Amino acid sequence: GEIAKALREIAKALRECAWAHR
Amino acid sequence: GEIAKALREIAKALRECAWAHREEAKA
Amino acid sequence: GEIAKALREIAKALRECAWAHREEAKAL
Amino acid sequence: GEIAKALREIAKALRECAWAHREEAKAL
Amino acid sequence: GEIAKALREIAKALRECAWAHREEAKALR
Amino acid sequence: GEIAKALREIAKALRECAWAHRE
Amino acid sequence: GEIAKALREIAKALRECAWAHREEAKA
Numbered sequence A: 001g002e003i004a005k006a007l008r009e010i011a012k013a014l015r016e017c018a019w020a021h022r
Numbered sequence B, G: 001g002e003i004a005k006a007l008r009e010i011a012k013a014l015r016e017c018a019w020a021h022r023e024e025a026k027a
Numbered sequence C, D: 001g002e003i004a005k006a007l008r009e010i011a012k013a014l015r016e017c018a019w020a021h022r023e024e025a026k027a028l
Numbered sequence E: 001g002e003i004a005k006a007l008r009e010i011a012k013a014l015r016e017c018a019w020a021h022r023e024e025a026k027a028l029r
Numbered sequence F: 001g002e003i004a005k006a007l008r009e010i011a012k013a014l015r016e017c018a019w020a021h022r023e
Helices: A002-020 B002-026 C002-027 D002-027 E002-027 F002-022 G002-026
Strands: none
Touching: A002 B002, A002 G002, B002 C002, C002 D002, D002 E002, E002 F002, F002 G002
């Protein structure tokens, strides 16, 4: 579903926020 | 749908927040 | 719809958090 | 609706997180 | 509702993240 | 509900993000 | 459900964000 896909996109962005902290 | 579209906008904003932190790490 | 509008408000707030943090990075 | 109200509360809290950074930006 | 209650719990957690950021920044003086 | 449980998990994770900077 | 699974993925990402911030603070 499109909503689930967007939520996974949100998670991916948050993983970027954590990896930026590298 | 517009809910999914708004959620994608949130993801986009969070990628900004990632970009800002990278600029923080380099500063 | 009201939920979509609230979600966009969340996105706006997060753009406001990115802006504020860039200013921290520039203040440092 | 209650869900939209809670989502707006989340946006408001995130504007607080921005505020916290701005106060820092003006200090630092 | 349970979903709304959980979302409010998220808002509360974020207000805690704002408070913590403010104190961390002040702890670094 | 499963969605409500995951949302509470998100809240719990955010409290960890707060404790990290308290730490 | 797929939505609940995605939300749990978001929670997991935020737990990453706490681990990363904690190490930043200790570094």
